[PDB]
Amino acid sequence: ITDSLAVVLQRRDWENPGVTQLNRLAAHPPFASWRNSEEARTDRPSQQLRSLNGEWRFAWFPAPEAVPESWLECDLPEADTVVVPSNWQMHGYDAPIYTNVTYPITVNPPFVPTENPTGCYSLTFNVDESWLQEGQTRIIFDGVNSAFHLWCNGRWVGYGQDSRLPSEFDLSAFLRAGENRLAVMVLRWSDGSYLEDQDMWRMSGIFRDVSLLHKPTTQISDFHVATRFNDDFSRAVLEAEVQMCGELRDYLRVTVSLWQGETQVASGTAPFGGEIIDERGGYADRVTLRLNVENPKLWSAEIPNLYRAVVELHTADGTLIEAEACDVGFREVRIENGLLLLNGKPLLIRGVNRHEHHPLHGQVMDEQTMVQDILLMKQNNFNAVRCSHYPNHPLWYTLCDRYGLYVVDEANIETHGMVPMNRLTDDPRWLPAMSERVTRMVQRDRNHPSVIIWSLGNESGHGANHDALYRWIKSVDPSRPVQYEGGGADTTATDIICPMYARVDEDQPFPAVPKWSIKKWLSLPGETRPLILCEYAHAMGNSLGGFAKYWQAFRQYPRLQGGFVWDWVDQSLIKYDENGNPWSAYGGDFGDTPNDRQFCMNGLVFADRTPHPALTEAKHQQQFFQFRLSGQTIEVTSEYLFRHSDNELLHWMVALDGKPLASGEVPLDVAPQGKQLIELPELPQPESAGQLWLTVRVVQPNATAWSEAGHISAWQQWRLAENLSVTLPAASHAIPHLTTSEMDFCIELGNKRWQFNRQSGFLSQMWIGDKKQLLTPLRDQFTRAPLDNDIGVSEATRIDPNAWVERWKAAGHYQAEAALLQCTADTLADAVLITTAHAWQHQGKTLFISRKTYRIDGSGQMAITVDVEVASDTPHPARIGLNCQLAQVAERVNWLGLGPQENYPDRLTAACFDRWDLPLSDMYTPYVFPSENGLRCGTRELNYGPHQWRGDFQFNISRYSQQQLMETSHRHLLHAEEGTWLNIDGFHMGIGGDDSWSPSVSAEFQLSAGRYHYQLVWCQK
Amino acid sequence: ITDSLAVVLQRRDWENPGVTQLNRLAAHPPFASWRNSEEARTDRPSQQLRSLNGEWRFAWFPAPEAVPESWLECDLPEADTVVVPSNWQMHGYDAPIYTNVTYPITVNPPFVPTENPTGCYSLTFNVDESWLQEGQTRIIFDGVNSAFHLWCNGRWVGYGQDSRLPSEFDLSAFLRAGENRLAVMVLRWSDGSYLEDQDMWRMSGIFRDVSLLHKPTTQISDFHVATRFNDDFSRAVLEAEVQMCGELRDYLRVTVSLWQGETQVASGTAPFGGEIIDERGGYADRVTLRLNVENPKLWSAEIPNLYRAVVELHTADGTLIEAEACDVGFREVRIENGLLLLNGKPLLIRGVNRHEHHPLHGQVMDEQTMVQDILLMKQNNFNAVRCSHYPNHPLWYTLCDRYGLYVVDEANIETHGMVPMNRLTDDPRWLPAMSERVTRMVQRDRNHPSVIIWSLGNESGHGANHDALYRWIKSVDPSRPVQYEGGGADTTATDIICPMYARVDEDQPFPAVPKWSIKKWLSLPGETRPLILCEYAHAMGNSLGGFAKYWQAFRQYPRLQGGFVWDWVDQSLIKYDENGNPWSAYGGDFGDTPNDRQFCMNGLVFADRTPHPALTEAKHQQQFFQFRLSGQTIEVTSEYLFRHSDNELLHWMVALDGKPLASGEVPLDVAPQGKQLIELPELPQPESAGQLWLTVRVVQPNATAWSEAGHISAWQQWRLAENLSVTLPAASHAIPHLTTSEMDFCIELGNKRWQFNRQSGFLSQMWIGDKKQLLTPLRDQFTRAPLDNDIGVSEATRIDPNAWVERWKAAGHYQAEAALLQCTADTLADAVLITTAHAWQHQGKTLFISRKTYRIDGSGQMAITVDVEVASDTPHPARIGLNCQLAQVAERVNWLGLGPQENYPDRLTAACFDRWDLPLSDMYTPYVFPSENGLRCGTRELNYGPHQWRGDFQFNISRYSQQQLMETSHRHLLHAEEGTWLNIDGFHMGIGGDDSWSPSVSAEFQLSAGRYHYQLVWCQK
Ligand SMILES: [Mg+2]
Ligand SMILES: [Mg+2]
Ligand SMILES: [Mg+2]
Ligand SMILES: [Mg+2]
């Protein structure tokens, strides 16, 4: 009866920050309750640990109040059978919401709305009665969002808050032998929701594992590990502290053993009872052991050496009560003199922020995905990751410990939508709630070597609660620094200056929380801390422009120790069309209101873990080897702090315009932080005209755990020389023949014909034989289908006038009208010459002027010369080029220029100058939200079909017109147009990306010169 | 129904540290809701504030479960009518318990025992319906111990923990017009009890005020005040921050005005809306005003200048919504360079720890008592007080603000009985509970100028929770330092080294938490903080020995800035005997188990606020004026930091053995921290033999608020000279006449006769005329009825062998047997001479030997000479003297020596050498727990009755024998013996008191010389 819903829900615990749990056991590191030492030592599965994952019954309601009393006793008739874990929105019950800052519910702390989607889960299972006779049986929920009540066999058990950490309960007294029934009522909204405003999809349910653990009555209740070293790390001390629960007897003992695989490295045994701590004594129920280790093998992301530690609770006779274990990594993290050091050396963090996301499963995680991520990261030169913005699934840590990644563990607290941001964080009333969120995290994760920094949360302003908590951690775990960006990134609550989106050289001086140029930030008066950006380089859409500026600064300034890119994967969800066709969905695609559209897609990889082209730029800038070329000598520098280049081969190669003249291989032998000089054999000195280029690549001959054999980990290229062409084209035996009509000028030469419309002044058509080559005339183009960065946050309802797009639109760039000023034709002795001049205007203003010359010679080549003038007072244009729709459609694209991937002016360091050949399809970048894409820069020759173009330009080629890209909101809706659309740019604006809600394209990448000149040659084969 | 006990008590909130309150409103400074500015400004009573104090119905039960459902609806038949506030133990319901460290309940956090004394209070009252139409009506409980549930009109309202701070609830929605009924169920024990283990009587109930407050819907919800100054305090800025609750509208305004009595000093008006604090904005519902004040009058305990500040919430038109106010003191507290400064000057704290205690009302406080305490303190030279160990009744602060006392406000947290002491404080699970205890205190008290330091609690070891909380305060209120003694007195959680019971020069090196000599403590490597003892000089019983050593150190070392004596009043309770006679009761007197007996009595004053003699010693050592004598010049030094000696007169006086030769008066004119030289007129130079002494006294001519006219605030005395007596007694015309019997020697001379028993060797009787003068023979005495300090914690069951008493007992001091070694009589020409020698032995060992001579001359004077030898290996004896029971009983006692109050060797600086005359009754000190008392030292002549004694000794005189004192446990049980008992000591051991649970008598005060000599003359008139 007091077990009744009517009674239980009366209290409304979910609308009270004073109640964050009821009957929840204490937090602790991960337990298995092994009953055999070897099993524990080898990480076998323990039988006192059982999964409850699988099929469960589920039913949904609009409000907790609508749940019917019966539910407690009997399964419902209308209940479905569902898989657990999972997020109910993923099964159709309600919609997932994609809002960023703005809370999904109404802001009225600590109330939640009355319609509050309740999900009743239930499960019927069997308990072995052995478990029922002796010991303790508890249930563990790894994650339930956002709050929940629990009943067992009709009996009310407890309540829990904080969707990111485990909730544990003693079931010992509710269990019956045989058949038992759990009834879990999960709520969408709770007072906990106010602390969970992260920018992600808002979902719900039992999204992480469900388990049962059987423990002895007298058990190991907690244990901590710590490593101390001498000056040179030649000697260490492992110190373990163990605590017990139960019946304390003098025959109890604890033993701790450390293993290196198979070898036992150290052991220690002792009886309970600590050292005196105060006037009242010590802890009778704890004991601390100290093991000495000589010449320990250190853990690092470069070489994740691990040890195994076993903790056995036993009697003096030798009889084992239970065993627990963990992997141990010997490393020291410290900040000294402004620098963050690891094992004595200063790190350089190549990081990324990563959310727990699956296009299919929502927020549910699994081994396979986790590993995939890890591999990709490691293969792309990343060495660290940040748990944006809550503790992650337990297994993650282990994987990082094993694979070698530095991790920042972050408390599940984000109050982004409050106003001001610290409205709750500065309130004592919310202190207790915040507290649990930090303490519990620490208690659970602190034995993992890969966690090297603790974070208090995200975007919750700065309040006293933060200071109090920062201090708590500092007292309980002094081995790791603490960081927190809120309230200015440099408050008293952080050991590291960790801004988000601060620029390299420009200051953004917002009131109260300005963001200084990172180089300047360090030098502010009295500042002495290291600086590591918690978030930088917003990878939304076609982005990562300017990435290299950061790397260069990081490399030049000691106290600039790196950052975490934002972010790893796009948060897109899969949906289906009527033909059972899947497509990538974003904010608002589920009828979700309010929503933030594409804002959920900022990753370096697509939801499916397929790479955006930006990933290469990252990989290259983050490479661990650096090169300098001096004469015939290449100087290699290693940025590894601990390892020697012992799985590295250097391949080099010389080519003349794509043609290879010489190749070689040399094995690397560089010590961490050292240099290696590589003497090049005498290089070939061709006579032929062209550009000679040297390219080097570093290859990993042997496979590793995160890479295959032959993995390329770094590269670099240099232009060695250039032989200018002083040649003259030979005589033609004829010259083109001109023909004036009223409508056009027509030039003919053999099968070839070209026609210029006299009213438009454009080359309107051209034939080869009797085959027309164009579907659209060739014309100047000054705009681009806007990128996400060009748009920022400008919405149609709420326009942002500073956004590039808003400015282009308003200046009429998109709707300017060409006006023919002049179109003449003349016959020279060697060719035919056409001259045009056009002006683009808009409402009286002349935005641009384009003057050209076309010269067709007896060889059938058409040379085009373009000179453009841009009104100094018009917003700089996105591009300066030409376009046309070719009639033809071919398979491949071949070019001599930078590649092979998409590259833009402020994102092209990773690209290489060579000869590339790809399928047409590869020249298109399927950004979920479409825009200008696919460009390749520094191109000297382009071939497609029978056509060939030469000059010095940038281009893109595909089946979609700029107009289509710009008018279609999702990639799945684009339709291939009639032929091939080609955009040849003399110049193109950068893409930016320092952030996606303000203009972020640096000045050096804006087309601000006023006058531009370019030229090309078009011909057929 | 959910309002039902069965349901409400089901949760068992009182056995869960996770639930510390339910539906409790937020904390804030004190509100009245004035509706008129002048009323607020003059502190008139506000009508929106109503007391519920008075008669209430009460009923008691053994357990919450035994409360009957009806209670909710209907008053009980068996209910009594009781006064509220009060402690139910004081009304007979159950017993108050006096335990110190050891918890009154079984240690099993967070469970409380099943028998848990429930007190059901109820009250029926009327609500004006005006209050019912508009606004908000809340109820406020200033203090309820230890936990409680509340119902209004049958409806369940909320729950609360923390017996020391106010609990508030919104009654708005439960009130009916007219007749309403409250039903409050109070519990003795709760999980809160684990944090309330202070050494005091354990009581319960509604011990502080009950009120109702009517507030507007749109109100002032909080406000803070702050004062900043320039370098020289010539200019200040008052800064007030105000927050509102309700409906925010643009016509709202806030005005803050500052008044100096009648004069308006400054004002400011503004509309809501703060400055930007972070990326999301500012607080729309707050506003901060800044008033400039030139040449502010500073607040100090020396001159409590106050200002009045008024806060008015109003509309733009001028219509007042509500007003709040407070007294403001302009002062700056800071620690700089190792020193604690106030207004720029380094303090010297003359403090005392004070509990809230009434012999009659228990823990209930009232204005009258509070003021009495304040007066006494101020009159005894105290300037500060510590709220040992919880926030006090609200009015206290105000009184201190007004009278001028520095206060340390202390959170209600003490976990003394845990093991180790920090078992809970170091646990995150208890963090939330601890947190509320600190935050709420700060929120309530922070506007009071007299609070100058915050304290995190007492005897709770040291845990991370403390660090976190220390930091929270530092962030929220940087204007006051934070201190906390636990875990060693010098942890990271304190800004001041604040030990308890550390000695002046000796170290007490306990493991983990040693207590160094305070002079040494400051110099420890790397230490730089100031040192102020949170507790020192344990005033238990006949104590305060050694007080002067502290004052001298404090005065010599800059960083030793004082301390707080332990403690103000004895915690004794009144009881009655069958004749309706009241007596002072202590631990165990109520059948209370377990108990700590007299340990609850450690004050400088008796429960009735009558002074123990130690108070004078304190008063003198703490005096604010110091004197030096050079030649005929007296040099006066002032220890006032802010005031000039403007109500001070110096009276001086010269006397020769008690006879006055010259007197004078001079007015003081000393600036704070200055000197004044006083030239003495030529002093008299008597020829007569004796000691010439100069005495000075400082008098306050005019009354003050805490003193009457003619109050003596300081004194000092010096021996100027001495003229030795070279005189010879004149001839007698006869000499005594001897007579030997077998049994005795009998000497006769006139009416006078003396008899010496030949078997005992003692003067057995003496006559004057036919009147016998003694009831007991004159004999050596080497012991004393033990003081509290002599006993310490030795209990009869659990003996403490280091306690002095244990050592004396064991050496047989108390049961040694005198043995006559020799008894001879001889006739000289001028007198009769008797010689004796005795040995005191015990089990074969000779402890002492006493050799005397008695010489009776023709003048009828008997001169006695005593030479004692003490075995070097026996514990030093308490005293070396003689005693006897005189037959006579007189009215007065007259002596020439130190006085007038009781003084001991290590407690006699406050005493003065003069001629005193008191009533016999005054020579007895009625310590509730009886012991040796009443001594007066440095006595040269003593007169009682017809007798007169001369020499140089110490004595005591009363109707109780040492044996009676030592055998009677309470003062009320002593019975006057037959005549007068006199103890004449040649020497006496010090009393100690650095602590009362270890030997604390310094070596210089132990009778360790081995050989002692003394002499006297006895005669009659
Ligand atoms: Mg809650
Ligand atoms: Mg956010
Ligand atoms: Mg509780
Ligand atoms: Mg205590």
Coordinates of C-alpha atoms in Angstrom, one line a residue, chain B residues 14 52 90 99 144 174 184 211 279 296 352 356 359 373 379 478 481 565 596 638 645 674 713 731 746 857 977 979 1016:
Chain B
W14 CA 14.7 11.2 9.8
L52 CA 2.9 32.3 17.9
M90 CA 12.4 20.8 31.4
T99 CA 27.1 13.1 27.8
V144 CA 13.3 22.8 16.7
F174 CA -3.5 25.9 3.8
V184 CA 3.9 19.7 14.7
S211 CA 6.2 33.3 13.9
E279 CA 27.4 34.9 -22.1
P296 CA 32.3 57.2 7.8
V352 CA 35.2 33.5 25.6
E356 CA 23.0 29.0 25.1
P359 CA 19.5 26.7 34.7
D373 CA 25.9 38.1 29.7
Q379 CA 32.6 44.6 32.4
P478 CA 35.4 37.3 1.1
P481 CA 38.2 35.0 7.3
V565 CA 38.4 30.9 27.2
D596 CA 29.9 12.9 32.1
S638 CA 46.8 52.0 26.3
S645 CA 40.9 57.4 27.4
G674 CA 49.9 55.5 23.4
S713 CA 38.5 48.7 34.8
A731 CA 60.5 41.9 79.4
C746 CA 51.2 21.4 80.5
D857 CA 57.4 33.1 76.4
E977 CA 30.8 21.3 61.3
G979 CA 33.5 25.0 65.0
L1016 CA 54.4 31.4 62.9

